[PDB]
C-alpha cells in the first residue's frame, strides 16, 4: 500500500528477494523450443515378416483393435496395415491425460490380447510407445569413403553409442534410423534338392544346434554327506560367428560325408531390415534422434550430448564422422538473446523518453531499476507455477516488458508532476500522488486480469499456447502492479528531489483549443465513431487466419513418390538426382541432404523416398534470394522435370502438432457392409464431385496408396495329398523361401541379435523362380513345387487403413483462396451425404479440434466483458461511468487491424496476443483519465465537461510517453528480417499499428464519450 | 543357468532398455550362478513409486521378447517395496516332530 | 589392508572365481550312430539340472512337479558315464561314448553398476577416524590403481557425499536470508551489519 | 571447521546385528553348515549374557 513510502528499506528488501528468486528460477528452469502442445498419442507397432496388407489386417490389426476398450480419455484410434508386414495403431488421448498411464493401460490390454496373435508376430514383439515428437537433435553418423556400409554404421551406433547416450542428463529417448546386424542364411533350392533337404530341416537344425542348454550343477542340492565338490556344468552355448553357423550339421549320408549348412546355404552377417536405404550426401549413413526429457534444460542437454559424442569419437573404428542435422538449440538461444536485447533496448528507450520529457536524471533512474525486478520476479513466478522457458513464454515476457513500462512511466510522471506544482516536498508529493492513483491501479489490475483470463481458459492444442501467453501476461501484470504500489513510491520519495518545451506546450494548447471547438456538436463525431466501428467489422472479415507463422528453421523436406510397383533401384536413382540437384545447384545455401529411400509418409514401400535438406546458418544466407520459402519455390520448378517421379519439396511446420492452418483432415468410413472396392468407388466419386466445385476446396486428395498387381499361388491340396506331399510343407517352403523366417537369437559380441532364414536373391526375383523349389514326399523323394501349384496375377491393396475399427480412406484436403475452414467442412459434409448409401464421414486430427470447441471464445470474452464492466462499476461507484471507458477499446483494435492489413500478415497467435495487449493498454489509459475526472467531480466541485477536459490535459504527458516507449520498443521487430523473423514481424506490426492509433483516437474521443454517457 | 549365461542374455537384455526413466539416480545389477538376475533401479527422492514402477514395467516389455524361454515362463517380478528386512518371523518345533 | 589406522574390515561384496565343468558333445559321431543331439542335451539337462513338469494338488494347494536324477548319480564328474541315450532303433548307447569332459574357470556372480561391470566393496573406518576420512582415503587409494578403473559412491555414501557438498551453500543462503529479514524488520542497514558480526562467535 | 571430521549419521544400538560367513569358492553346504554352527555356538556360549 502507501506505507512502503515510510519504509524504503522494506521495499528494497522485497526487490532484492524478487531478484534472488528470479536468479534462482533462471538457474533451474526447463527450456525448449515449444511446450507439449499435441494431445498424447500412443503407438502400437507389430511386425509380421513376409505378410501382406490383407493378411496383417486380418491377423494382427483387427485382433489388437478388438481389445482396445476400457481406455480412459481416448479420443480416436487409427490403424494402418502395410504390405511390408507392419501394423501400426495410433490412439489419441485427450489433453491432460497422463502419457505414462495411457501407455501402461494400452500395454496391459495388448498384453492380455497377446495369445490371440500368430506366433510369428509374438516372436518379433509388439511395441507400445509414447509419442511426443519433441525431437532435439537428429545427429547422424557417416562413413568417409566407402568402408562401412549402412548396416555396419547402424549396428555400431546401436551397440556402442545408444547406451552411452540415453543416460546423459536430460536425454529421455534415443531412436535409431537403421537396422542392426543379423545372421542371414540364404538358401539355394538346387543345393537343397541335391541333398533332399527342405527349409524346415534347416530351421529345425538351427533351432537345436544354436541353443543354450542349462547343464546344471555337479554336487548341487540335495547332496550326499561328506560332499566336497560343487561346480556348474556347461553343455552348449549359443553360436556367435558366421563360420560357426556354417558348420551346423544337417544330415549324414550313407557314404559318410557330412552335410553342413554351408553346403546348402550362404551364411553372412547381414541386416535385420533390408527395406531402407539411408544416404548422407550420397554416402551410407545411420542416424539417431534424441527426444529430450521433462524438466530438462535443452541447452545443457545439447552441450552434454555433443561432449559425449566427441568423447566416443575416439573409439570409432575408422572413417566414421558425426554430423548434426536438425539441431534446435540455436533457435532457443536466438529467442533468449532476442528477449534480452528487447529488454535492454526498452530500458534504454524509457531512459531516453524520461530525459526527453521530464528532464530529470533522478526521475529516469527509478524505472531503470524497477523493470528488471519485475522481470526477474516474473521468472520466479513462472518457475513456481510449473512453467517452462519456451518461445511462447519468452514472447509473453516481451509484451510484458511494455506492460511494465506503462506502469513505471505513469507512477513516476505523476510523482514528478505533483512535485512540479503545489511546491510540495518529494515525500508529501509521493503520498499525495499515491493517494490519487491507488484504486485506479487496483482496478486496472483487475480489468487486465479479466481481459487475459479467456486465453487461459481454452481447450485443445491452441488452448495450451494461449495458456502460456495468458499466464505470462497475467503474472507480469500482477507483479508490476504490486511493484508500482510498493517499491516505486519508495524510490520516488527517496531519489527524486524538488526547444521541446515550447513544442509540447503548443501541442497541449492545440489539443485544448480543439476540444474547446469540439464538445458542442459531438453528435457528428458520434456517428463518425460508428463509421470506424463499421470499418472494424469489415476489417475483421478480411484478414486471413493462420495458426503460427512458418520460420526459417534451416531445414526443409522433399518427398519423392514413384508411380506404382517400382523397385528400390528407380527410387534410389530418383533420390540421387534430387540430392545431386540440391548439392550442385544450391551449394551456397544447402549444406547436406539425408535421403531415406524405401520409407515415405504415406507408408513404407519400395516406391517412396524422403529427403531432409539442411541449410547453412542465417549468418551465411542473407536476403530474400537465400530464404527457405524462396529456396523451395526455386526447387519446385527444377524438380518438376524429374522424369517419372512426383518429387515435391516443402517447409517443415512450425510445430510438429500441425500445419496447413487452412487445410482439413477427414476420413471416409465405409460403415455398413460394403467392401474395399465399393469404398474406393465412393472415394473416386468424391475427389471428382469435390473437384467439380473449385470455389471452396482446391486440394482434395487421398493420403494412401492405390491398388497394385499381386501374385497368387494356388496349391492343389488334393493333388499333393494324392502324391504324398503334405500341404503344410508346401505352404511352409514357399513362406520361408520368399518371406523371411525368424528362427532364434544368437550373441554377437555380447549383444543379442536375430537369425533369419530366406532364399538367396537370384532365386526369389521372378515368377519363374517358383519352378525351382522342391518339396519332399512322405517316402523321402523330392518333387517340384510346379506340379501341385498354379500361378495367377490379381490386384490388391498394398496399404489398408481403419478408423475406430471401421475401414476408412483419409481424404485430406485444403481450403479455397478465401472460404474459411468451417465452410469447407460443411461442404465436404453433405458431400459425403451425396455419396452412395452406407458410407459415413469423420473429422480427425485438425478438423476434430474445430468440431468440439468452436463456440467457446465468444462465451469466454462475453464473461470477460461482464467482469470488466463490474470491476469498473465497483471502482467508479456508478453504473454509467464504466460505459465511457468500455466504449473506447474498439478505437484501440481498429488501428492494429488496419496496420496488420497494411503489412499483409495474417491472424497469427502472436497478432492476437499483441492485439489483446494493445486493448489492455488503451483501457488502462481510459481508466486513468476517467478516474481523474471522477475525482475532480467528487471534490473541487466541477461540472463533467471541465473535469474531463482538465483530466485529459493532465494525463496527456504520460500517455504520450508510454505510447512513444512502446512504439519504439517494437520498432526493431518490424525491421527484423533474419532468424526468427515471423513472430517478431507479427508482434511489431500489431503493437506498432495498434498503440499509436489507440492513443491518438482515445486522447480526443474520451471527453465526448464521457459527456454523452453522462447526459444519458 | 550359469552366471555368465544369465548376465549375457537376461541381465543385459533387461538392462539395455532401462534408460528413459523419470528420476533415476543409479542402477545396479547382479547375475548369479543359481540363475538369478537382480536389476535394481534407485530413483530420486520425492518420486512416486507407482509412476516409477509403471515406467519400469513399460520399458521391460521392450526387452521381454528378447528374453529366452524358461525365464518368461517363471515370470518377471517388478517390486516397488523396500530392499531391507523389517522383521523376521521364524517357526520351530518344540519336541522335534516336524523337520525343516 | 596395510593401512589399518584409517580403514578396517575392507572386504568385497561378491563371490570369487570357481572351477566349472564343461561337457563337449560330438554331434557328428552322435548322428553317425543315430542318436540325436537334442536327446543328449535334454538327458543331461534333466539329469543334472531339473525339469519342472506339471502342477499337482497337495492338501488343497497347487504345487509343482520336478524330475531330477538321484542324489548318488549327480555328485561326481564320472557319473556322466552312468547315463544312456536311446538310439533311433531303440538300442541304448552310453553317454560317455560321444562326449568329452574338461574343467574351466568362471565367475559365479557378475555385478554391473550404471551399465558397466563393477565390484562392490564394503568396509568400516578405523578407531578415531570418521566415515568421511575413510571415504577420502578410499578415493585416494583408488586413484593409485591401473588406468581404466574408476570408483562410485552408492547407498549411504551417496547421501553422505551430497550432504557434505551441499552444507556450505545452505549456510550462506541462511545467512543472507536472516540478514535481509533483519533489514526488512528494522528499517536500517546498521542493525543487520552489527548483528551478523556475532555469528562467528 | 577445516579440521573437524565429517560424517552423515551417528551409529546406533538397535539391539540386533548381523554376521556374514563366506567360505572359499567351490565349497559345499556340508562345510558352510559347520561354520554357521560354530558361529551359533560361539554366540550362544561366550555371549549368553547379552
Ligand atoms: C512477510 C509477511 C509479513 C509481512 C508483515 C505483516 C505486517 C505488515 C505491517 C502491518 C502493521 C504495521 C503498521 O503499523 O501498519 C499499519 C497497517 O498499515 C497498512 O496499511 C498495512 C500494511 C500494508 C500491507 C503490508 C504489505 C506487506 C507484503 C509484503 C510481503 C509479501 C498502519 O500503518 P499506516 O499504513 O497507517 O502507516 C501510516 C500511513 N497511514
Ligand atoms: C501455498 C499454499 C496454497 C497452495 O496450496 O498453493 C496453491 C495455491 O492454490 C490455492 O490454494 C489458491 C489460494 C490462493 C493462492 C495464491 C495450490 O495449488 P497446488 O500446486 O498446491 O495444488 C494444485 C495442483 N493440482
Ligand atoms: C515477490 C517475490 C516473487 C514471487 C515469488 C513466487 C512465489 C510467490 C508468488 C505468489 C503468487 C501465486 C503464484 C505462486 C503459486 C504457485 C502454486 O503452487 O500454485 C499454482 C497456482 O496457484 C496459485 O497460486 C494461483 C492463484 C494465484 C492468485 C494471484 C492473485 C493474488 C495476488 C494479487 C496480486 C498482487 C496485487 C496487489 C495489489 C499451482 O501450482 P501447479 O499445480 O501449477 O504447480 C505444481 C505442479 N506443476
Ligand atoms: C490489495 C491492495 C490494497 C491496498 C490499499 C489501496 C486501496 C484499494 O485497493 O482500494 C480499495 C478497494 O479497491 C478498489 O479500489 C476497488 C476497485 C476494484 C474492484 C474489483 C473488485 C471485484 C470483486 C478501496 O480503498 P478506499 O476507497 O477505501 O481508499 C483508497 C483510496 N483512498
Ligand atoms: C484473488 C481472487 C482470485 C480470483 C481468480 C478467479 C479466476 C480463476 C478461477 C477460475 C474461474 C473460471 C471462470 O469462471 O472463468 C472462465 C471465464 O473467465 C472469466 O470469467 C474471465 C474473468 C475472470 C475473473 C477475473 C479475475 C478476478 C476478478 C474478479 C472480479 C469461465 O470458464 P469455465 O472455467 O467455466 O470454462 C469451462 C468451459 N465450459
Ligand atoms: C507476494 C507478492 C507475489 C507476487 C505478486 C502476485 C503474483 C500473482 C501470480 C499469479 C499466478 C498466475 C498463474 C497461475 C497458474 C495457475 C495454473 O495452474 O494455470 C492454469 C489455470 O489458470 C488460471 O487459473 C488462471 C491464472 C490465475 C491467475 C491469478 C488470478 C487472478 C487474480 C486477479 C486479482 C488480483 C489482484 C487483486 C488486487 C492451469 O489450470 P487448468 O488448465 O487446470 O485450469 C484451472 C481449472 N482446473
Ligand atoms: C517470515 C517469517 C517471519 C515474519 C513473520 C513473523 C511476524 C512478524 C510480524 O508480523 O511483524 C510485522 C512487522 O514486520 C515488518 O515490518 C517486517 C516483516 C518481517 C519479515 C521479513 C520480510 C522480508 C522477507 C525476508 C526473508 C524471509 C523471512 C508486524 O509487527 P509490528 O506491527 O509490531 O511492526 C512494527 C511496525 N509497525
Ligand atoms: C489496509 C491494509 C491493506 C492490505 C492489503 C493487502 C496487501 C498485501 C498483499 C500481498 C500480496
Ligand atoms: C497466498 C499464498 C502464499 C504462499 C505462496 C506459495 C507459492 C507456492
Ligand atoms: C477478485 C478478488 C477481489 C478483487 C479486488 C478487491 C479489492 C482488493
Residue numbers in the entry:
A (entry chain C): 2 to 499, 513 to 1030
B (entry chain A): 52 to 151
C (entry chain A): 705 to 905
D (entry chain A): 554 to 603
Copy the relevant paper text:
Bacteria can resist antibiotics and toxic substances within demanding ecological settings, such as low oxygen, extreme acid, and during nutrient starvation. MdtEF, a proton motive force-driven efflux pump from the resistance-nodulation-cell division (RND) superfamily, is upregulated in these conditions but its molecular mechanism is unknown. Whereas we discover distinct transmembrane state transitions within MdtF, which create a more engaged proton relay network, altered drug transport allostery and an acid-responsive increase in efflux efficiency. Physiologically, this provides means of xenobiotic and metabolite disposal within remodelled cell membranes that presage encounters with acid stresses, as endured in the gastrointestinal tract.
We reveal that drug binding domain and channel conformational plasticity likely governs promiscuous substrate specificity, analogous to its closely related, constitutively expressed counterpart, AcrB.
